[PDB]
């Protein structure tokens, strides 16, 4: 039930490139071609009629308004003006329409010529240096060696070689009919059109069947490329460009600085250079200029289009105002600061804030303290809804004015808005999944976030300057899922190893160690008998025994002493068969060949406090 299922990529034919642009109008002509390098008008902030910002091609600048101003109103739908032929519709369509530029001479795509694998060189059975020399007008190439002895197909000639061959072909004495053709331009279109993929593949297979040596991998690569082109039903000559497309004008906008100066993009300069060189070359071709200048113009146009596609890949980098390079089309997508890693795999979001963190004791784990100045901003729509429904206000404008005026009712509404609504807290270097956690907020006074001390090692937090970010979930699914999968009170163990992660760490372990240790001095009240642990705690609370004294208590349960003597000691067989075995830390008294009658433990009031606290927490 989704809109689409997969994404497919392929080579672009000139028909497709012209079809992306070239829309139609209710008349006898099409509009989608860019012909002049003007961007905007200097006197009035308006775009020209045939340029990089035109309105007949790319759409109107202001929605439901024409260039001449004759038309207006949303009544006019799908009707084009007459004085200037600008369709009347929304201006957002400006970031869709493309347009195109028609080249007076073919140029080669630099991705398919200058690559780590070069596909033109592989297809043509030629080294990269020879192809690069034929392009850029450094040498010639023979297209038909007919009726000659020292000339072969796809052989690189030179200026002097071509002149000396011309000295013989132009004599027309004999034995030179069927004039051979040599061409110092690209002529890559002719060489790639002459390909006959099916029989080339058959011949390559027939050769690869017999003999291998150690260097048949070249023929394997050629066969792979040929089979790819056969299967895709593409044409190799599409690697040489004849038209190019133009990006919509909102993706290369004009921005105005503070002092009235313009900061134009780097794509506009490259497009301007391409258009200017193309127009000049077409003009020269019209007048039938000498060929040695037309070739210079063609080489310059090749270099311009190459610099537009990718800057500094083959030749020299094109520098702009300063000596810094311009940003081409490939720099938009390729880097770490390119589109992929900066805008698609991570973005900026709404309903978010950031502040410093302080320590909050007396908080429970799963609770956090949020300042009152951030909550009124992150929770605005819920406050507005509650103000409209209960405490009937009227409209949204009155609710916003009430919030702005800082009425006392605002905080009463907010306190009941935020209860039961979880919030997600995050710290900067998120190294594992416990760097984002969900809490329940409590409104505090101040400008710092309060964090429970028991979650610091998970976040790797510390209260000497650290900062945290806050996000809120909006829908029911996000809320239920944050409560049920991410709440900070259900993150006991770690995913790397099953060891516990929420334990008293720094100042609580010191307190437990002091409370439960032993002290040879300060032992007032040692050797006193108590019934149950609560009596001992009550006797210590009102000062009558020390925190480190040794006392006997009555405790029927399981004990675990350190430095214990597992062998019974001081067995006194008393009367009536009753036996009272006295250990180092226990005084069990057992009946005759029967069960246990009583037990006593020699311990310390601090240990009684510790164990009573644990037992009370578990049983309640």
């Amino acid at each position: 039930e989704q809109r689409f299922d997969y994404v497919k990529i392929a080579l672009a034919s000139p028909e497709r490139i012209r079809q992306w642009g070239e829309r139609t109008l209710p008349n006898g002509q099409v509009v989608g071609e860019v012909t002049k390098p003007e961007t905007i008008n200097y006197r009035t902030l308006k775009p020209e009629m045939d340029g990089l910002f035109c309105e007949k091609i790319f759409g109107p600048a202001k929605d439901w308004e024409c260039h001449c101003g004759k038309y207006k109103r949303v009544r006019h739908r799908g009707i084009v003006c007459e004085r200037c032929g600008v369709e009347v519709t929304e201006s957002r369509v400006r970031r869709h329409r493309m347009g195109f530029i028609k080249l007076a001479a073919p140029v080669a795509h630099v991705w398919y010529l200058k690559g780590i694998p070069s596909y033109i060189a592989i297809l043509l059975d030629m080294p990269l240096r020879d192809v690069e020399q034929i392009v850029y007008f450094n040498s010639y190439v023979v297209l038909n060696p007919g009726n000659h002895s020292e000339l072969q197909y796809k052989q690189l000639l030179n200026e002097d070689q071509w002149m000396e061959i011309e000295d013989q072909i132009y004599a027309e004495e004999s034995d030179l009919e069927g004039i051979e053709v040599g061409i110092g331009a690209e002529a890559l279109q002719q060489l790639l059109q002459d390909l006959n993929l099916n029989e080339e593949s058959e011949k390559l297979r027939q050769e690869i069947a017999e003999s291998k040596g150690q260097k048949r991998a070249k023929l394997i690569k050629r066969l792979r490329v040929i089979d790819n082109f056969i299967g895709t039903e593409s044409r190799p000559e599409w690697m040489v460009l004849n038209v190019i497309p133009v990006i919509p004008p909102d993706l290369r906008p004009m921005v105005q600085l503070d002092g009235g100066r313009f900061a134009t993009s780097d794509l506009n300069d490259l497009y301007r250079r391409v258009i200017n060189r193309n127009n000049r070359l077409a003009r020269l071709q019209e007048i039938l200029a000498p060929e040695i200048i037309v070739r210079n113009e063609k080489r310059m146009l090749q270099e311009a289009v190459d610099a537009l596609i990718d800057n500094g890949r083959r030749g020299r980098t094109v520098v702009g105002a300063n000596n810094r390079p311009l940003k081409s089309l490939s720099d938009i997508i390729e880097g770490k600061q390119g589109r992929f890693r900066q805008n698609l795999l991570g973005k900026r979001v709404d309903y978010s804030g950031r502040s410093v963190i302080v320590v909050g004791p007396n908080l429970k784990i799963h609770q956090c303290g949020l300042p009152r100045e951030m909550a009124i901003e992150l929770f605005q729509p819920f406050v507005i809804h509650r103000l409209i429904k209960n405490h009937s206000i009227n409209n949204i404008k009155q609710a916003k004015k009430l919030i702005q005026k800082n009425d006392p009712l605002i905080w009463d509404v907010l306190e009941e808005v935020i209860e039961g609504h979880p919030v997600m807290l995050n710290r900067a270097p998120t190294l594992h999944r416990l760097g984002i956690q969900a809490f329940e907020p409590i409104l505090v006074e101040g400008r710092a976030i309060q964090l429970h001390p028991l979650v610091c090692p998970a976040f790797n937090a510390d209260f000497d300057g650290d900062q945290m970010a806050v996000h809120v979930p909006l829908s029911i699914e996000a809320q239920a899922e944050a409560r049920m999968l991410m709440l900070a009170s259900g993150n006991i163990l770690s995913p790397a190893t099953g060891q516990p992660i929420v334990t008293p760490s720094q100042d609580m372990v010191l307190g437990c160690y002091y409370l439960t240790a032993e002290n040879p001095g300060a032992q007032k009240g040692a050797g006193r008998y108590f019934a149950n642990l609560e009596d001992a705690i009550r006797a210590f609370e009102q000062g009558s025994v020390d925190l480190h004294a040794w006392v006997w208590v009555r405790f029927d349960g399981e004990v675990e002493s350190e430095g214990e003597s597992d062998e019974p000691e001081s067995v006194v067989a008393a009367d009536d068969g009753t036996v009272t075995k006295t250990y180092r830390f226990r005084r069990i008294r057992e009946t005759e060949d029967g069960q246990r009658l009583s037990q006593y433990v020699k311990t310390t009031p601090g240990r009684i406090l510790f164990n009573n606290t644990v037992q009370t927490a578990l049983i309640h």
């Binding site: 672009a12 493309m98 900026r348 979001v349 992150l378 996000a478 100042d507």
Partner: protein, 1061 residues
């Protein structure tokens, strides 16, 4: 303390530029001649007739202008044949001038030029080892400016030469092309058979073929020519305009190779090349007097300051100017010319402006307090135009070399990517005229230190054969050295010798550290990392309302404050006749009057106050050199950055946990730790093609309830309290659409309030310069007083940072056996794991000093006099305080540093005594009022339609990809999808979500975000045919291409979410 002027690198460099830096560049370019040789221009660059500045320092500061002068050079134009000489004076440019403190004022901002540590010119030898081959040696010859030369020895015994980055070629070609016969190069070399091997292997060359081959290898593809090779060599190495060794380059070449060439000649010659080849041969053959070089040694490194960099910029501008002059001079056949109409000063003006405003060596001044300002001018950088790059600097450049001793501080650096790349000059170091750092020593004769014989300054290479003793050795009568074994340094190693064999002794024990690190008492009891932290954090403190001196200072405070130029001392030795908040006057003994004016509540680069107050009263006897008035961060004479407060070391009920700080409420209502911050706002009235802009109070769509405090001219009044969203200046623009004006008056940003203290304004037709197209400028200054509060950062001098978490009423704090509640409680868990033992010494000595009213001073490394000097002094002081006061609870012998403390909530004493004292704490510039931000909905980006970023423009928080991974590991699917689409860039789902939340319904399903469509358009524009397809249901039907860029729902889609009504 023999300390001379601390900021003297900048002053010496600028004085050198003025004296002989501009003359040398102006006179190296003067005779400009055209090709016919008929006209000549001479620049008599010796007068310069500098014109006095039109604006004072204060006028430039308050007007937001530039402090500069004008340069005029006399020129003469000479016509050959027909005698015709014209004389005149031409305008060359505007030179910004250096103020009395070593800084520049550019566009109303204080700027400083940083010093740069680079590699010195000369010849450097190195030995490289192959994977399987022998050792092969190479030499590199590097000039101040020009082409580099490289010699290399092969595995077979062959010598090869490389020029710049051309191909390698045998040395015989180069030596014969230079014009040397076989006999002289045979005699000069010491081992001629080693070179004879190369001669035999590569074939003898004559001059003609030598130049032929040299031309062929340097510039391939052209027909060889003898004159071509001659011109190429002359332009490459022997041209003063294209090659320059420098004075230092000639000095280093002569020093290493042992030559005798004159100091005036600054281009390469034949003897240098012959000597370099001979040295390479000897190093290969292990002659005995040859050695490879270390490039990190401070004897191979140089310092460049403002003079040299300005000289280079002037040279470039002058080259451009000469090009313009030569182009313009020949365009006219008839003379009809004057030297004034020939020169155009635009390129030179542009070059100077670019150097002083947009370079990466001119930096915005650090001005939080006088200490930061002082240490910003003594900083050394290894990066810049002519140094290193961040990706190329590695482990070897960021280390400590044994040659930094006494020249670069080993403590003060940044932490992070800049650690080891920026350093600080030590206390006693100074730079000589070649560019090398020196340091002073005293002479030792027969074991006796001669403290009366003018200490000598020595560079890193000089003090390698001597045995140098440290500055902590103890003498008996400022004479003979006591002891039997003495530590010394010999050839970058630490040894011990008898004290009849040392040569020099360092001046002071603090000669090794900088000025910021010299202000930490009891430093030798601290770790080095925490010392770095404390020294760095001492420069982020904020000047307080009433400053106060430390009780346990170190002795360098009065010298660190005299360089900022804010303390006034009387030169008179007389009487004081008039004292006022803004003026002081002192009369001598019949020696006229001296009057001083004081700055009042000014503003620094970082929005801090710059007040100045008097100390004296009327009719006071005053001596020479006595302090008369002092600045905003100094008590009488000396620096005062913090306050002395009562401290106890113990844990509270969890409020001390992991560096948090618990303070008392006395620090709030006693106005301790409160400061003044001043901000500046600006508005501009410009003109537009539609029309001009007018500043007036007739603003549309506003009521009289919002125009109370405007002065019937549209500008607020001095002394008004402004809260958030209040109009300051009222402006209207002439929009095109009755009333045709629109309101965009400037208002205070959200979160700002205070008093209006200044409304200075400037306009045309009054003598004020304005940027083009503007009519008037209005500047408003707003001040406020800030108190300490929960979330602020506090610090000490020993590296202990913290954030305040609670402010207790004074009846809850623990109190002493006399009833005095404490001021701060600190956790003792943070001391033993980080090894700041000096803070306890400081606390105990401050306690004794408070009880005695003494104000002790202790200098670092104080244990050369005894075995445990600090402990004994502290114990003796505490015992003396106990005997003088009469209270026995002050000091106890069982627990020296600990006394009894009670609980303010219950009244019961704690089980064991705790440590209390007086601590000197500072308040840093990181305040929580500037770190809190929140957003619900605001502006969006233009291309991607994602929320903007930034606190100042209602920006959103970034959800990077690490957080995406964390949400994927949880199993979260709906939180992630809500974050990615509805809250970022789903242009239609944002409004639907907001309206659903307000109305109380369910949030609808999202669509495709805009960034994916942007990426598809960008990929299509690269001639790639990419599309999205929907699969066919039946068998032979074709898959259908889906059109993403076409909304099917003809419903409202605004650019930003809006509330329905």
């Amino acid at each position: 303390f023999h300390l001379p002027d601390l900021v003297a690198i900048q002053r010496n460099s600028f004085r050198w530029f003025l004296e002989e830096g501009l003359i040398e560049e102006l006179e190296s370019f003067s005779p400009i001649t055209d090709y016919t040789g008929k006209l000549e221009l001479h620049f008599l660059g010796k007068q310069y007739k500098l014109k006095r500045p039109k604006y004072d320092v204060d006028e430039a500061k308050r007007r937001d202008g530039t402090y500069s002068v004008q340069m005029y050079v006399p020129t003469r134009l000479i016509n050959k044949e027909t005698g015709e000489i014209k004389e005149q004076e031409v305008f060359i440019g505007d030179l910004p001038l250096m103020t009395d403190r070593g800084t520049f004022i550019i566009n109303g901002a204080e700027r400083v030029i940083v010093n740069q540590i680079v590699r010195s010119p000369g010849v450097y030898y190195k030995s490289e080892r192959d994977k399987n081959g022998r050792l092969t040696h190479n030499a590199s010859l590097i000039p101040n400016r020009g082409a580099w030369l490289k010699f290399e020895t092969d595995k077979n015994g062959l010598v090869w030469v490389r020029i710049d980055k051309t191909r390698k070629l045998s040395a015989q070609v180069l030596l014969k092309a230079l014009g040397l016969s076989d006999n002289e190069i045979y005699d000069k070399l010491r081992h001629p058979e080693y070179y004879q091997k190369t001669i035999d292997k590569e074939g003898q060359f004559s001059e003609d073929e030598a130049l032929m081959e040299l031309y062929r290898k340097l510039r391939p593809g052209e027909p060889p020519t003898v004159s071509g090779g001659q011109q190429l060599l002359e332009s490459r190495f022997f041209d003063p305009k294209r090659y320059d060794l420098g004075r230092v380059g000639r000095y280093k070449l002569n020093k290493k190779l042992g030559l005798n060439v004159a100091d005036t000649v600054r281009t390469l010659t034949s003897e240098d090349i012959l000597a370099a080849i001979d040295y390479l041969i000897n190093l290969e053959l292990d002659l005995g007097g040859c050695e490879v070089d270390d490039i990190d040694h401070l004897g191979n490194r140089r310092v460049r300051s403002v003079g040299e960099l300005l000289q280079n910029q002037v040279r470039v501008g002058l080259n451009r100017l000469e090009r313009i002059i030569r182009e313009r001079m020949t365009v006219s056949d008839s003379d009809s010319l004057s030297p004034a109409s020939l020169v155009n000063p635009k390129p030179l003006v542009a070059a100077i402006k670019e150097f002083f405003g947009s370079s990466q060596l001119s930096q915005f001044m650090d001005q939080t307090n006088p200490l930061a300002e002082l240490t910003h001018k003594r900083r050394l950088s290894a990066l810049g135009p002519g140094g290193l790059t961040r990706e190329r600097a590695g482990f070897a450049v960021r280390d400590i070399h044994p040659s930094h001793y006494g020249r670069i501080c080993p403590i003060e650096t940044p932490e992070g990517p800049n650690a080891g790349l920026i350093g600080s000059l030590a206390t006693h170091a100074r730079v000589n005229d070649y560019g090398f750092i020196e340091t002073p020593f005293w002479r030792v004769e027969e074991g006796r230190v001669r403290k009366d014989l003018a200490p000598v300054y020595m560079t890193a290479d000089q003090e390698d054969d001597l045995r140098v003793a440290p500055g902590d050795v103890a003498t008996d009568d400022a004479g003979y050295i006591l002891g039997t074994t003495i530590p010394v340094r010999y050839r970058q190693d630490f040894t011990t010798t008898t004290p009849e064999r040392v040569d020099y002794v360092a001046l002071s024990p603090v000669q090794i550290i900088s000025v910021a690190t010299s202000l930490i008492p009891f430093l030798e009891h601290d770790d080095a990392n925490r010392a770095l932290m404390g020294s760095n954090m001492q420069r982020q403190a904020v000047p307080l309302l009433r400053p106060e001196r430390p009780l346990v200072g170190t002795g360098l405070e009065p010298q660190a404050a005299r360089d900022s130029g804010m303390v006034i001392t009387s030169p008179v030795d007389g009487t004081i006749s008039y004292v006022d908040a803004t003026h002081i006057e002192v009369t001598a003994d019949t020696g006229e009057k001296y009057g001083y004016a004081l700055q009042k509540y000014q503003r620094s680069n970082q929005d801090t106050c710059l007040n100045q107050r008097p100390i004296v009263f009327e009719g006071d006897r005053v001596q020479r050199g006595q302090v008369i008035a002092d600045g905003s961060a100094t008590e009488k004479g000396e620096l005062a950055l913090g306050q002395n407060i009562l401290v106890a070391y113990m844990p509270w009920e969890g409020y001390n946990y992991e560096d948090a700080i618990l303070i008392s409420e006395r620090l709030v209502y006693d106005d301790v730790y409160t400061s003044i911050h001043i901000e500046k706002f600006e508005i501009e009235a410009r003109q537009t093609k539609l029309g001009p802009e007018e500043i007036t109070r007739e603003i549309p769509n506003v009521g009289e309830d919002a125009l109370r405090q405007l002065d019937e001219n549209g500008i607020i009044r001095v002394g008004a309290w402004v809260e958030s969203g209040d109009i300051l200046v009222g402006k209207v623009t002439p929009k095109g659409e009755a009333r045709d004006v629109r309101d965009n008056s400037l208002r205070v940003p959200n979160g700002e309030k205070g008093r209006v203290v200044d409304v200075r304004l400037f306009t045309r037709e009054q003598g004020d310069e304005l940027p083009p197209g503007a009519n008037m400028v209005v500047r408003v200054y707003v001040a406020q007083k800030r108190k300490i509060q929960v979330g602020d950062k506090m610090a000490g001098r020993h590296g202990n940072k913290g954030i305040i978490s609670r402010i207790l009423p004074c009846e809850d704090m623990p109190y002493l056996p006399d009833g005095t509640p404490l001021d701060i409680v600190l956790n003792p868990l943070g001391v033993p794991s980080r090894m700041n033992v000096g803070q306890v010494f400081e606390c105990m000595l401050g306690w004794a000093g408070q009880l005695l009213d003494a104000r002790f001073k202790v200098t670092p490394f104080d244990e050369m006099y005894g075995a445990e000097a600090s402990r004994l002094t502290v114990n003796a002081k505490l015992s003396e305080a106990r005997e003088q006061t009469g209270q026995p609870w002050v000091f106890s012998d069982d627990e020296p540093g600990k006394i009894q403390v009670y609980d303010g909530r219950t009244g019961e004493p704690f089980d064991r005594p705790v440590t209390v004292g007086r601590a000197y704490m500072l308040k840093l510039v990181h305040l929580v009022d500037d770190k809190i931000h929140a957003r619900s909905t605001g502006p969006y980006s233009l291309v991607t339609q994602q929320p903007l970023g930034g606190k100042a423009q209602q920006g959103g928080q970034r959800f990077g990809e690490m957080e995406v991974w964390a949400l994927e590991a949880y199993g979260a699917a709906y939180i992630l999808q809500e974050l990615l689409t509805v809250k970022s860039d789903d242009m239609q789902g944002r409004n639907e979500a907001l309206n659903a939340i307000v109305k109380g319904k369910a949030i609808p399903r999202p669509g495709t975000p805009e960034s994916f469509k942007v990426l598809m358009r960008e990929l299509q524009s690269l001639c790639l045919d990419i599309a999205v397809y929907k699969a066919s249901t039946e068998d032979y039907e074709e898959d259908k291409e889906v059109d993403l860029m076409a909304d099917v729902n003809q419903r409202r889609t605004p650019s930003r979410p809006t509330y329905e009504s």
